[PDB]
CSV table of C-alpha atoms and ligand atoms in Angstrom, one decimal:
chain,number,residue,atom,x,y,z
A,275,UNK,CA,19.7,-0.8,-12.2
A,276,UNK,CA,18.1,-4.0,-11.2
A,277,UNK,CA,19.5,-8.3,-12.3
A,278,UNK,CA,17.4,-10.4,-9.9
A,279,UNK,CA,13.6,-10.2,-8.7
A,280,UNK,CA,13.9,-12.7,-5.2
A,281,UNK,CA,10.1,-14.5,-4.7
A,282,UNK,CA,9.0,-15.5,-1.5
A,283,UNK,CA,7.0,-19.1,-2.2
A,284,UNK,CA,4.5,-19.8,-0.1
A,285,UNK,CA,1.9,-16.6,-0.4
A,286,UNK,CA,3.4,-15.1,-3.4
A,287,UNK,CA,4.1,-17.7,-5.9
A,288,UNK,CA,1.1,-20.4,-4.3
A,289,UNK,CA,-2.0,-19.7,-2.7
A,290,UNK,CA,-0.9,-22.3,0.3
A,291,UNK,CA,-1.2,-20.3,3.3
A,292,UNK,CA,-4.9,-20.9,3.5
A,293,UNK,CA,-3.6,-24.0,3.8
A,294,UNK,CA,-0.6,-23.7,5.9
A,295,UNK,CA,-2.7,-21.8,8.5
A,296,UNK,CA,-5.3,-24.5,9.1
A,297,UNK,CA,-3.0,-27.4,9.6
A,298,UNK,CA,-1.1,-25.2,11.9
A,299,UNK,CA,-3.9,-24.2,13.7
A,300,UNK,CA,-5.0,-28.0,13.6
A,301,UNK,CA,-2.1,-30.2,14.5
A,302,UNK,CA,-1.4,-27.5,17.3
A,303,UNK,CA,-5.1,-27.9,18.6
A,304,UNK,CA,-4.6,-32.3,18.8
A,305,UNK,CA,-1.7,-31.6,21.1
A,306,UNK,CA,-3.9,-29.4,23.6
A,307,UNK,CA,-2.1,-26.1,22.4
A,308,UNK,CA,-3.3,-22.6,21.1
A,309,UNK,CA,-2.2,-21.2,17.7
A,310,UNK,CA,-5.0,-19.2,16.1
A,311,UNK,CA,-5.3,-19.6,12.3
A,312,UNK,CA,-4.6,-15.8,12.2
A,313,UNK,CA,-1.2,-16.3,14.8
A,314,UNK,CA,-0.4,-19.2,11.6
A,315,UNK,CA,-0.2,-15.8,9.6
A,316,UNK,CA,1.6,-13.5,11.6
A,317,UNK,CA,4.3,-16.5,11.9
A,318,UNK,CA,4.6,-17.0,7.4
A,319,UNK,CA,8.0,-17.5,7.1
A,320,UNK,CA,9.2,-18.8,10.1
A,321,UNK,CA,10.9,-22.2,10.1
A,322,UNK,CA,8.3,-25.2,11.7
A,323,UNK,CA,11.0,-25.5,14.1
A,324,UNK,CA,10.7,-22.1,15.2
A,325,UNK,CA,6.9,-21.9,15.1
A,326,UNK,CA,6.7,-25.0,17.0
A,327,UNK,CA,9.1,-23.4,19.9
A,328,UNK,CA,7.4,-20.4,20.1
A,329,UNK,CA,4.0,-22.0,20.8
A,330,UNK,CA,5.8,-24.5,23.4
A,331,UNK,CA,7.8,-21.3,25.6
A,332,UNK,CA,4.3,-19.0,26.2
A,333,UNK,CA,2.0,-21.9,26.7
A,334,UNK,CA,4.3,-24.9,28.0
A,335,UNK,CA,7.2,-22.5,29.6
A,336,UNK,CA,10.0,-24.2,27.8
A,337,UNK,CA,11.4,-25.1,24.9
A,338,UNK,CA,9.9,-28.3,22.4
A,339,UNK,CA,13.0,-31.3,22.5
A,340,UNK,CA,14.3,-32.1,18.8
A,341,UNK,CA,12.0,-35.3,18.8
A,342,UNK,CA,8.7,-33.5,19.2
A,343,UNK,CA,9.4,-30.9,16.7
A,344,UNK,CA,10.7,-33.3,13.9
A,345,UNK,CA,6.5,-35.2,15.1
A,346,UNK,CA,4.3,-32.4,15.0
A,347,UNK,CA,6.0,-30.9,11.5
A,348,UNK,CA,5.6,-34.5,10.3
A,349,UNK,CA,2.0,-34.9,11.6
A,350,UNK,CA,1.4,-30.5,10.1
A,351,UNK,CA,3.5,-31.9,6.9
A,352,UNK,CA,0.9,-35.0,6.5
A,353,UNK,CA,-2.2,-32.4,7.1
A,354,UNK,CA,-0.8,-29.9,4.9
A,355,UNK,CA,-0.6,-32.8,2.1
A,356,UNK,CA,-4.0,-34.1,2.6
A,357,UNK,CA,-5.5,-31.0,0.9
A,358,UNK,CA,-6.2,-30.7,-2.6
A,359,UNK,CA,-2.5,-29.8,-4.0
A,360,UNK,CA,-2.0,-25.8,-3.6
A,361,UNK,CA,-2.3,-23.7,-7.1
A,362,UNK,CA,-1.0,-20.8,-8.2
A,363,UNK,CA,-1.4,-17.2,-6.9
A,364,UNK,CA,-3.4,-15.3,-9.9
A,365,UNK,CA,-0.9,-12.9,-11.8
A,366,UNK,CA,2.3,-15.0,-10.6
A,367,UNK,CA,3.3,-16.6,-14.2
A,368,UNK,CA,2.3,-13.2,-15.3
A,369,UNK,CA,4.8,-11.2,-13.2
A,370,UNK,CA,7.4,-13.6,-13.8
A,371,UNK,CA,7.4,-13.5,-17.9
A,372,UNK,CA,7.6,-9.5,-17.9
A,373,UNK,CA,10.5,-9.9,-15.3
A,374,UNK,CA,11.6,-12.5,-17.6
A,375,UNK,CA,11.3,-10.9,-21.0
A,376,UNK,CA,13.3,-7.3,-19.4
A,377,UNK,CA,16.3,-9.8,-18.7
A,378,UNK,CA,15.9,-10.2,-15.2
A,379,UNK,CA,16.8,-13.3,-13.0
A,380,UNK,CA,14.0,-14.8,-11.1
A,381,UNK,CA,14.9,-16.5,-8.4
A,382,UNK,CA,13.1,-18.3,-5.3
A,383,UNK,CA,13.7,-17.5,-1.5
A,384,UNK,CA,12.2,-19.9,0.8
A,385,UNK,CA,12.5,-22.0,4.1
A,386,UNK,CA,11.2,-25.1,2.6
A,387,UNK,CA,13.4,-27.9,1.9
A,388,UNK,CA,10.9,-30.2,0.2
A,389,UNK,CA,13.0,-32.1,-2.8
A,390,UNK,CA,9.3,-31.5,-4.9
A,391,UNK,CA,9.5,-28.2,-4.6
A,392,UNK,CA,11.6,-27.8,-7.4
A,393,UNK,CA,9.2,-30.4,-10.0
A,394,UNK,CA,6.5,-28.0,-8.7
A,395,UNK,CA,8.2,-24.8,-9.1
A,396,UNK,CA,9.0,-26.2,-12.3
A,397,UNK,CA,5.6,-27.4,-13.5
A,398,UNK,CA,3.8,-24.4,-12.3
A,399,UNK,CA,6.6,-21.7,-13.6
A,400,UNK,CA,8.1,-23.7,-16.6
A,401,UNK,CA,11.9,-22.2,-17.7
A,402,UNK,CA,11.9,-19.3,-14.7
A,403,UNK,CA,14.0,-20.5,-12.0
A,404,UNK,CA,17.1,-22.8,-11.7
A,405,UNK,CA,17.6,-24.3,-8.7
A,406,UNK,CA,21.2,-23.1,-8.3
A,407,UNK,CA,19.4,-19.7,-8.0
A,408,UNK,CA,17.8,-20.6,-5.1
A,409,UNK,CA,17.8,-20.6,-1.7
A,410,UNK,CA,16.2,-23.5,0.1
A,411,UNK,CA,15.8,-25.1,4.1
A,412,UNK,CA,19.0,-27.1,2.8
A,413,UNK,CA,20.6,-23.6,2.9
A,414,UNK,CA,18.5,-22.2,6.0
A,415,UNK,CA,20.4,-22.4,9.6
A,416,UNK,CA,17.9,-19.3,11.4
A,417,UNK,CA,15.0,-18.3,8.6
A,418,UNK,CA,12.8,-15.1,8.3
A,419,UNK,CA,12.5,-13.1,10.1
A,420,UNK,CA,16.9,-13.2,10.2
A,421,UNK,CA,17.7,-11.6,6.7
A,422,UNK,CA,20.0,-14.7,6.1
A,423,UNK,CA,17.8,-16.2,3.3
A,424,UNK,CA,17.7,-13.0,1.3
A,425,UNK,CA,21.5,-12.8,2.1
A,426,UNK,CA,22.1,-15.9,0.4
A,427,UNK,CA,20.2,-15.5,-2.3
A,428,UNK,CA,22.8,-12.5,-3.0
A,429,UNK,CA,25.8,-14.7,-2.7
A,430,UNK,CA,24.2,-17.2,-4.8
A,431,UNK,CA,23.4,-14.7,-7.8
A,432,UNK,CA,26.6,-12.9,-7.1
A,433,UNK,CA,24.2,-9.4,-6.4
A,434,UNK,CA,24.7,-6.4,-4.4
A,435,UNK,CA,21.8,-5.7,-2.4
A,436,UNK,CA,20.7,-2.3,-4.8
A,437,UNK,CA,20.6,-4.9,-7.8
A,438,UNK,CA,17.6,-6.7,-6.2
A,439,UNK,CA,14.0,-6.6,-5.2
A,440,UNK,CA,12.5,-8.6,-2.7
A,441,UNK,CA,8.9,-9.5,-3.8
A,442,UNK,CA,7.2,-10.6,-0.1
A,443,UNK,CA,3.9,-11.1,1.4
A,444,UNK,CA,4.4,-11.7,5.1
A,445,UNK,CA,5.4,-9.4,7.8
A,446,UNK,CA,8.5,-11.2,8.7
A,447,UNK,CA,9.3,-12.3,5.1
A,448,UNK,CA,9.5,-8.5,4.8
A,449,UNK,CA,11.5,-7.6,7.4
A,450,UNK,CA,14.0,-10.3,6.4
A,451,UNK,CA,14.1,-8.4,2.8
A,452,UNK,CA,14.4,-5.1,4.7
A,453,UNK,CA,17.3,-6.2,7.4
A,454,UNK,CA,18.9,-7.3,4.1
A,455,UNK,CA,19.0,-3.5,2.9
A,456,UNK,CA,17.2,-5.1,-0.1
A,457,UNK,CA,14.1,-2.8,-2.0
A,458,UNK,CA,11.2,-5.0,-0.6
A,459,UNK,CA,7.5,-5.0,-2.1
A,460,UNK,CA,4.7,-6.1,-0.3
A,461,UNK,CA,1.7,-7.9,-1.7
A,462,UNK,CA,-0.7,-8.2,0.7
A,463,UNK,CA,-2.2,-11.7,-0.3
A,464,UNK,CA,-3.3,-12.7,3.3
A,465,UNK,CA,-6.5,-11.5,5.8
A,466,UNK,CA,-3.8,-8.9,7.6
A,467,UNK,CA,-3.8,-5.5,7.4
A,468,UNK,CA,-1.6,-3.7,5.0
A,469,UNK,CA,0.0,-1.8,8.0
A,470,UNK,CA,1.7,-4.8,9.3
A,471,UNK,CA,3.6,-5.3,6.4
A,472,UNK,CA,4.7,-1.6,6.0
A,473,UNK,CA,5.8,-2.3,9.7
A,474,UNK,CA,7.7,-4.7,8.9
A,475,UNK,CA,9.7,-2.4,6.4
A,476,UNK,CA,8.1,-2.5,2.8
A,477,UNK,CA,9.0,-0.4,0.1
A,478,UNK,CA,5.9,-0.4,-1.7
A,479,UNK,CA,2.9,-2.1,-1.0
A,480,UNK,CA,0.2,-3.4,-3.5
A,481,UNK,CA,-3.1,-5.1,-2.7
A,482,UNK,CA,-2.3,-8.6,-4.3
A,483,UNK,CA,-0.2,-10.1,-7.6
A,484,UNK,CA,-1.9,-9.2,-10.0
A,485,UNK,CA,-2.1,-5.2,-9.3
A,486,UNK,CA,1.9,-5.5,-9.0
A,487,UNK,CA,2.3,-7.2,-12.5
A,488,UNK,CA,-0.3,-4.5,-13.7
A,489,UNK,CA,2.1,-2.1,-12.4
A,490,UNK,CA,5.5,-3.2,-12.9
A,491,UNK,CA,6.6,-0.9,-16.0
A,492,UNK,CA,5.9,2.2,-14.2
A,493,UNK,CA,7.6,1.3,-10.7
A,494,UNK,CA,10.7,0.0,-13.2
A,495,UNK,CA,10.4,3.5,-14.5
B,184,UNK,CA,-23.8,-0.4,-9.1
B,185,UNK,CA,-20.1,1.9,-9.1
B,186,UNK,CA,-21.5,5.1,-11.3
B,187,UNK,CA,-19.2,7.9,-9.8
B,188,UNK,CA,-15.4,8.3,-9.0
B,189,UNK,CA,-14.5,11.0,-6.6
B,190,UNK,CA,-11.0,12.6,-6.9
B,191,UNK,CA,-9.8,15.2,-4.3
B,192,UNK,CA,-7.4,18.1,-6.7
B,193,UNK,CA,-4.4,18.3,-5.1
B,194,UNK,CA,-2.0,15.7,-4.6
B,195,UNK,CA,-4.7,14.0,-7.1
B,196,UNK,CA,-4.7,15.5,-10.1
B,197,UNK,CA,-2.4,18.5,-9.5
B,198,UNK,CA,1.1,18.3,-7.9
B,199,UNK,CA,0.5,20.6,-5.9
B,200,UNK,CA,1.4,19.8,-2.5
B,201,UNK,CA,5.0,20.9,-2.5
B,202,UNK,CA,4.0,24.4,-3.0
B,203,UNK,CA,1.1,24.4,-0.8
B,204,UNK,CA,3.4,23.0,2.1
B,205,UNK,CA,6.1,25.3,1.4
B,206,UNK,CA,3.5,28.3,1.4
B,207,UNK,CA,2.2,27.4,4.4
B,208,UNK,CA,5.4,27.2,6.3
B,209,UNK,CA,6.9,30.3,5.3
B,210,UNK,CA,4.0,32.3,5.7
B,211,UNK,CA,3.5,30.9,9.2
B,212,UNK,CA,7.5,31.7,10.1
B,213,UNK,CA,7.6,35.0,8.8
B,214,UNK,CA,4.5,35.2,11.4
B,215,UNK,CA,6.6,33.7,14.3
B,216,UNK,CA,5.1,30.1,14.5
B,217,UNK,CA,6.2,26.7,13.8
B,218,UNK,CA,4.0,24.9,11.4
B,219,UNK,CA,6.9,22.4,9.4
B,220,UNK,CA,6.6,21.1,5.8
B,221,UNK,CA,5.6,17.4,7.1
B,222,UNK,CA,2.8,18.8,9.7
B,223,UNK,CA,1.3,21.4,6.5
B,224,UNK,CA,0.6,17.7,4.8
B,225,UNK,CA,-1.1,16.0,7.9
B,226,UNK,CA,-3.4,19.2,7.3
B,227,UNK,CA,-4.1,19.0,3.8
B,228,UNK,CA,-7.9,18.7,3.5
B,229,UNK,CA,-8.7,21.2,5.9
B,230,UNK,CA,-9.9,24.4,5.3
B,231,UNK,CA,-7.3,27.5,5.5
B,232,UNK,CA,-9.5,28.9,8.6
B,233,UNK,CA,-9.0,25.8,10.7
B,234,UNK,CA,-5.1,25.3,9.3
B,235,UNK,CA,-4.3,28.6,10.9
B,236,UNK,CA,-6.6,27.7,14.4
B,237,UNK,CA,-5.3,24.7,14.8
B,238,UNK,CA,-0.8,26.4,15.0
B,239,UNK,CA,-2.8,29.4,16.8
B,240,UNK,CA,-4.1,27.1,19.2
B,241,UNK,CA,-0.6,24.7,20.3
B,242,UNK,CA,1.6,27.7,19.8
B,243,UNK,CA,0.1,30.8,21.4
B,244,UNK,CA,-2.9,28.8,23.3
B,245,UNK,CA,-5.7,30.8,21.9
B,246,UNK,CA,-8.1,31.0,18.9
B,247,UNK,CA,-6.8,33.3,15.7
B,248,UNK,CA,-9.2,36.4,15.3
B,249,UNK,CA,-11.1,36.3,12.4
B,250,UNK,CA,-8.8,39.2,10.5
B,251,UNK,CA,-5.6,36.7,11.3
B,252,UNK,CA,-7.5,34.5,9.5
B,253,UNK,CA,-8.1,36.0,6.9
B,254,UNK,CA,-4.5,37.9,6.9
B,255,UNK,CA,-2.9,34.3,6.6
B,256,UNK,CA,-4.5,32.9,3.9
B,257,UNK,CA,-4.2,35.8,1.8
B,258,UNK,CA,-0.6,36.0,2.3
B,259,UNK,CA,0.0,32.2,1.7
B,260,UNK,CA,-2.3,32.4,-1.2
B,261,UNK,CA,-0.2,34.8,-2.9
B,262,UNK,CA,2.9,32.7,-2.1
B,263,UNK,CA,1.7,29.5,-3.7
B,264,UNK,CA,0.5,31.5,-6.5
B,265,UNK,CA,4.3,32.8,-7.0
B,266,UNK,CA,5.5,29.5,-8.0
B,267,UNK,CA,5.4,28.2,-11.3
B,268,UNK,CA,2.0,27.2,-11.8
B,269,UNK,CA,1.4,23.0,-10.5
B,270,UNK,CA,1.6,20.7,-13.1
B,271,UNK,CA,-0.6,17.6,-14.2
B,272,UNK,CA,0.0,14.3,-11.2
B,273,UNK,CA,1.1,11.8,-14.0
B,274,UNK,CA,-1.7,9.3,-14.4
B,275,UNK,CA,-4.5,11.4,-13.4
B,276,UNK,CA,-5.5,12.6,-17.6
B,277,UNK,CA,-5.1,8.4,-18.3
B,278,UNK,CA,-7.1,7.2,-15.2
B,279,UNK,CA,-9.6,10.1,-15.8
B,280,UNK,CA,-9.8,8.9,-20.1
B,281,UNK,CA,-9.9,5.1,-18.3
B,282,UNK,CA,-13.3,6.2,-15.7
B,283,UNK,CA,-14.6,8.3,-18.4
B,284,UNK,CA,-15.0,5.4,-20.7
B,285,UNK,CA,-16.6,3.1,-18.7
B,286,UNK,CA,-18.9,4.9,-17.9
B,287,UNK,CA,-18.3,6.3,-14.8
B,288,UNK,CA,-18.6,10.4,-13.6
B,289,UNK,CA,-15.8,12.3,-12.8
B,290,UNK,CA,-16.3,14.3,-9.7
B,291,UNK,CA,-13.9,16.8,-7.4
B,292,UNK,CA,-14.5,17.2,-3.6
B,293,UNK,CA,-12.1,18.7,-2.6
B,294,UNK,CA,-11.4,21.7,0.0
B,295,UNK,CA,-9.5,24.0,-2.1
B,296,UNK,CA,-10.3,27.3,-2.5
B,297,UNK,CA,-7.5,27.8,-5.2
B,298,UNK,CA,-8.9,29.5,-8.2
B,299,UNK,CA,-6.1,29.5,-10.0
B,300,UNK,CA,-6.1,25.2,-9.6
B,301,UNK,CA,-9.9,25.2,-9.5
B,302,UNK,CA,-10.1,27.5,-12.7
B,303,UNK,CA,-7.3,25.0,-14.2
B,304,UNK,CA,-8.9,21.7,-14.0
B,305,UNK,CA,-11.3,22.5,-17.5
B,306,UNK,CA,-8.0,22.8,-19.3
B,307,UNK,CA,-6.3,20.1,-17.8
B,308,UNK,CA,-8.6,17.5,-17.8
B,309,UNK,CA,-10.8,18.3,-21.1
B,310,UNK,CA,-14.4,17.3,-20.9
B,311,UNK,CA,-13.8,15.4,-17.7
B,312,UNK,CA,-15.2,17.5,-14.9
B,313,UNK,CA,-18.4,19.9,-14.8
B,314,UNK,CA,-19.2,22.7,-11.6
B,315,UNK,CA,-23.1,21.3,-10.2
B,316,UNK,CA,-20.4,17.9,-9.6
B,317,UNK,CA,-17.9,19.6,-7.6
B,318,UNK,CA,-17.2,20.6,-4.2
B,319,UNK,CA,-14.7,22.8,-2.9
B,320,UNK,CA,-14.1,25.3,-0.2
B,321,UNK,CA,-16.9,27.4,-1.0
B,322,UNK,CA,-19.5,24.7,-0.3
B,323,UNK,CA,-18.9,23.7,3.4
B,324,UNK,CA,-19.3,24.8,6.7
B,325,UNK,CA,-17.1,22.3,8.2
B,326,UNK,CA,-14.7,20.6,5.7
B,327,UNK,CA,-12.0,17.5,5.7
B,328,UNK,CA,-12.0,15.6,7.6
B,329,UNK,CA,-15.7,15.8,8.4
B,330,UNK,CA,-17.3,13.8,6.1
B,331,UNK,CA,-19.7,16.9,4.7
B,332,UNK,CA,-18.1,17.6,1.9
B,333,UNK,CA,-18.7,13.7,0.6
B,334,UNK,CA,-21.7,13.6,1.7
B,335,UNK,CA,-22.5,16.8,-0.5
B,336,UNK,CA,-21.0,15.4,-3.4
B,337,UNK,CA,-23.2,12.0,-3.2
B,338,UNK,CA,-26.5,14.3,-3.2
B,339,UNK,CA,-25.0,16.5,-6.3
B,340,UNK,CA,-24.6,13.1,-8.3
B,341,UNK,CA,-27.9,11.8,-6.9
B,342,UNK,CA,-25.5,9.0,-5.5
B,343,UNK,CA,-26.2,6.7,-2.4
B,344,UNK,CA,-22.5,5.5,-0.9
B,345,UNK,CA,-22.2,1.9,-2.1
B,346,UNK,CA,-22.4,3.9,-5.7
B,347,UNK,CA,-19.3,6.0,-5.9
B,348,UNK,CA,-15.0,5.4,-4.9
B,349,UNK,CA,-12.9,8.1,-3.4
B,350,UNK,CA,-9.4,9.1,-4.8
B,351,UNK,CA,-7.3,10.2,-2.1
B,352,UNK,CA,-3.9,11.3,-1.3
B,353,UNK,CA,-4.3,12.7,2.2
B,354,UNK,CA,-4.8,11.6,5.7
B,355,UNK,CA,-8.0,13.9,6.4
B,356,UNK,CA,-9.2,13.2,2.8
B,357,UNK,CA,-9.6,9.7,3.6
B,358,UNK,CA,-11.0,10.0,6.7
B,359,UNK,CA,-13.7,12.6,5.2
B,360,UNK,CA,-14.1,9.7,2.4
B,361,UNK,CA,-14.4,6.8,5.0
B,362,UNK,CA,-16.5,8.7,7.1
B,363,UNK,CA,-18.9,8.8,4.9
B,364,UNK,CA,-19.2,5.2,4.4
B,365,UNK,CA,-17.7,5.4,0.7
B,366,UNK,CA,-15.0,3.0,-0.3
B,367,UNK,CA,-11.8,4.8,-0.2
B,368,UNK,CA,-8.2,4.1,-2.3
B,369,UNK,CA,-5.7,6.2,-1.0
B,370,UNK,CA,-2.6,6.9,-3.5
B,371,UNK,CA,0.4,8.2,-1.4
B,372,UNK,CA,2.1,10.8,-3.8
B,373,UNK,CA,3.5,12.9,-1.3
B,374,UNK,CA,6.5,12.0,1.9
B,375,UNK,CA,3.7,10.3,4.6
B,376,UNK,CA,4.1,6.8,5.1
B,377,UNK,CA,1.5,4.4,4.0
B,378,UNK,CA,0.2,3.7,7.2
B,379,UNK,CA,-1.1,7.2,8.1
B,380,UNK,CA,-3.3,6.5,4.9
B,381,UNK,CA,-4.6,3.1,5.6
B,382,UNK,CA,-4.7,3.8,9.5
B,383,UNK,CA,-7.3,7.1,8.4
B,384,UNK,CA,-9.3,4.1,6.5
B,385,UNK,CA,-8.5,3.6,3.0
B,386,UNK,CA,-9.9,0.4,1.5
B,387,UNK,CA,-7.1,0.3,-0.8
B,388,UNK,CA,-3.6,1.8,-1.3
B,389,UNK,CA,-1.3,2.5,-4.3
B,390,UNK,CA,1.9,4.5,-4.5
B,391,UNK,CA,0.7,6.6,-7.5
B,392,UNK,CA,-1.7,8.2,-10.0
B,393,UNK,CA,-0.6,6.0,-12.6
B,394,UNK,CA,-0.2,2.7,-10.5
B,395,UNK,CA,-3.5,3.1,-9.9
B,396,UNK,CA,-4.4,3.5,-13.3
B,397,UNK,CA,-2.6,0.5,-14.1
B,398,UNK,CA,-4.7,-1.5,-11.9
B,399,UNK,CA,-7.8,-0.1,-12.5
B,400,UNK,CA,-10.0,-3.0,-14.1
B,401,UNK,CA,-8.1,-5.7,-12.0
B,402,UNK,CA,-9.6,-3.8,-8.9
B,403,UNK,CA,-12.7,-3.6,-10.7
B,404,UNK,CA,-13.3,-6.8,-11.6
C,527,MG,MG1,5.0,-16.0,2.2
C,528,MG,MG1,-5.2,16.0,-1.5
């Protein structure tokens, strides 16, 4: 029997990774270095810290100092934010007020540590989440794929991992919910292929938001 | 325009496939060869005759003589028929109502050559299906997961490709559908993971009959 539903943010709740992908892609490109809008995907998740390293160590052959990762997540930050604000992912307050109304806890899993998150969250998803039940950057030391966010998110709602689903839409999002020994579903609300996040160790996959909300009475049952 | 939905039968609208599995296996063990459970579903689709090549041809490196052939199926017919008899896949009657309703023909392709299913389908799904738009075993030369048998059931419907959506449960199914050019959902009702379905080309994938149903006009729209 399930007590908490665990939402990814970025992907599953907002349709930012449009978004996220470009100003990757972008910021990456005014530095002389290559991350394809489609690499941007198959990263979802990761810390900026982390993304940032990853594209240094194949392409530069060592590791980004502290000083250039805090200025090119500042300069993606500032591109991310130049874009018309990011709005909801269609069947997202829909999902959350059946989970709601069958006594469930929603909660929010993410690595961003933006204070606005939690106005947004709010404004978007009024009366759903409370920020104590929620795991944050301010809580995030390694970030998806490590299960540690998912793994906090327990501690925080005082769960064991059968009284939680993971609701994911990235690859290593999912493997974080899997390597948690958390139920994870998969909506696959990017360009990748389905397989990837079966890979990664879904549960269930659905084709986007909506078709889970559509479909949540019968996989409760 | 979508006029026609095409639903293989077992797996589909029958459960089925844990008899026809089992059958399989046994028969082929009292007959000294390995054909397991899991490798009897990566065949479903196919026609008995090519089933009972494809074991003759690994384990004893030679073709099976016509009157093996036809020894097999016999014997494995019999066995599936000595269970009791395969019940409804829930979903199919409400997803069948749902099609029916808007619009949309009912059709079974399908590589059976199960009378007692294929006799069963009139008084399991009332009103729904009618023989000049069905397929089965006795129409094809080739079967699952040649594309043929779609391609048959498109000309009995007077349908061109872009016009109809495939209902599939099976590896080979979904091929055949794909094959064809015919946009394919795969629901994986029986032990296979999800990939094998959308790796075979399935357009979309649900993990049920009545998931599937659920979604339906979200799909659609
Ligand atoms: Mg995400
Ligand atoms: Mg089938």
């Amino acid at each position: 029997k399930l007590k908490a539903v665990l939402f990814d943010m970025d992907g599953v709740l907002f349709n930012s990774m449009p978004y996220h992908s470009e100003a990757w892609h972008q910021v990456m490109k005014t530095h002389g270095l290559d991350l394809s809008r489609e690499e941007a995907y198959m990263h979802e998740g990761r810390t900026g810290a982390s993304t940032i390293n990853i594209v240094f160590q194949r392409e530069l052959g060592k590791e980004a100092t502290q000083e250039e990762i805090e200025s090119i997540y500042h300069e993606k930050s500032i591109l991310f934010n130049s874009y018309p604000e990011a709005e909801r992912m269609p069947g997202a307050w829909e999902l959350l007020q059946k989970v709601k109304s069958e006594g469930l806890t929603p909660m929010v899993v993410t690595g961003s540590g933006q204070l606005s998150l939690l106005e947004r969250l709010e404004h978007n998803f009024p009366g759903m989440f409370h920020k104590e039940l929620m795991v944050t950057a301010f809580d995030v030391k390694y970030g998806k794929p490590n299960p540690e966010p998912y793994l906090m998110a327990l501690k925080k709602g005082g769960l064991k991992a059968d009284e939680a689903v993971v609701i994911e839409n990235a690859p290593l999002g999912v493997e974080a919910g899997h390597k948690a020994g958390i139920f994870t579903i998969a909506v696959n609300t990017g360009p990748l292929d389905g397989q990837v996040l079966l890979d990664a160790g879904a549960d269930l996959l659905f084709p986007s938001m909506q078709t889970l909300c559509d479909s949540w009475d019968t996989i409760m049952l």
